Each structure stands twice: as structure tokens, then as C-alpha cells.
Design a protein around this ligand. Structure first.
Ligand SMILES: *[C@@H](O)[C@@H]1CCC(=O)NCCCn2cc(nn2)C[C@H](NC(=O)OCc2ccccc2)C(=O)N[C@@H](CC2CCCCC2)C(=O)N1
Length: 165
């Protein structure tokens, strides 16, 4: 059961969503980042450190954007078989945590782009608007985030999260 504070890290961004890993670090999927804009969350692009690879994008800000938060562990994907939750927020405001059994980390070619991703089997599916929603799982006491939603098959049964380099 994801607690409210964890949901409150999921943030509307561009054509999808992103996730506050910490008071200063925001992650999303590269292709939802809005093109040709000059500020994010009221900060000039000059003030933001941006690291982007394989459809994973990380923003690092120069001040605490979300001081109410603590830092949580960000992993490069998770072990195969791990059951994650995709913390989906819909435009209506509905919360939709989807259980996913994760498979292998792999390079993948999706609509011609290189994705450094991890596929999973949905155990209710994902829609075009859901990209950037975090894949998390609870490690003992703490929550770990390990990817951001990037793609799904036409069936919808298989989902892909982009993961850190
Ligand atoms: C968020 O931008 C959006 C999330 C889509 C979603 O979760 N469900 C929609 C299902 C409808 N749909 C879209 C597509 N297929 N079905 C196009 C892409 N899927 C695909 O090609 O799957 C084939 C595949 C799967 C695994 C490995 C190899 C091939 C798709 O989901 N595209 C994605 C946008 C691209 C854009 C460039 C970077 C990579 C993602 C998308 O629509 N995401």
C-alpha cells in the first residue's frame, strides 16, 4: 500500500508524469519532456542539471523543490521476478497502482528509439497518458523506485519502464 506522501511524489509533467526521488531530484521518461520550453517548475533551464539516456531523464535542481520529502533509493531496475507497483495517476485524479512482475533489463528498440528498459507482465492497463509514472517496490521498510513508465505492447499485457544507465 503506497502511502499518500509517496503518491504525492508523482507529478504531472509534459505529456505525462514524473517522480520526485528527493527534494532536488526529479525523474521522468525523456519523450514526455516538453520540447522548446525554457523553465521547469518555475526554474530556468540554466539552473537545472539534466542527465538523459535511453529514455530515462533525471533533473537535479539547485534548490530544494520538495523539502517535505526525504530521499528515497533509486535503482537501475530491479531483480527479475520482483513484483513492482506502477503508481499511475490519471488526469481525472484517480490513483491506479498496477502490480507488475518484472522481467529482464534489456536494450529495446521501440518505435525506432533505443530504450534502456525493463519489461514486465501486468498482473486495468496503461494508456498513452501514463508515461513517466514510477515503478516502485517496498524493500523491507523503505520504498525503492527503479524505473519510469515508457511503453506497452498493443495487447497491453506487457509494459516497459525506462531505467537508469
Ligand atoms: C506513454 O508515452 C505511452 C504509454 C503507452 C501505454 O502504456 N499503453 C498504450 C498501448 C497502446 N500502444 C502504443 C504502442 N503500442 N501500443 C507504441 C509503443 N509500443 C510498442 O511499440 O511495443 C512494441 C515493443 C515492446 C517492447 C519491446 C520492443 C517493442 C509504445 O508504447 N510507445 C511509447 C512511445 C515511445 C516513444 C519513443 C520512445 C519509446 C516509447 C508510448 O506510447 N508510451
Amino acid at each position: 500500500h503506497a502511502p499518500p506522501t509517496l503518491w504525492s511524489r508523482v507529478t504531472k509533467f509534459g505529456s505525462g508524469w514524473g517522480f520526485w526521488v528527493s527534494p532536488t531530484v526529479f525523474i521522468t521518461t525523456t519523450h514526455v519532456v516538453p520540447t522548446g520550453v525554457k523553465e521547469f517548475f518555475g526554474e530556468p533551464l540554466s539552473s537545472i542539471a539534466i542527465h538523459q539516456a535511453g529514455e530515462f531523464t533525471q533533473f537535479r535542481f539547485s534548490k530544494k523543490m520538495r523539502p517535505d520529502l526525504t530521499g528515497m533509493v533509486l535503482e537501475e531496475g530491479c531483480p527479475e521476478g520482483t513484483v513492482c507497483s506502477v503508481l499511475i495517476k490519471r488526469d481525472s485524479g484517480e490513483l491506479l497502482p498496477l502490480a507488475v512482475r518484472m522481467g529482464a533489463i534489456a536494450s529495446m528498440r521501440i518505435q525506432g528509439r533505443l530504450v534502456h528498459g525493463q519489461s514486465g507482465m501486468l498482473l486495468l492497463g496503461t494508456i498513452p497518458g501514463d508515461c513517466g509514472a514510477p515503478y516502485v517496490h517496498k524493500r523491507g521498510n523503505d520504498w525503492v523506485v527503479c524505473g519510469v513508465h515508457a511503453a506497452a505492447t498493443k495487447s497491453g499485457n506487457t509494459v516497459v519502464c525506462a531505467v537508469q544507465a
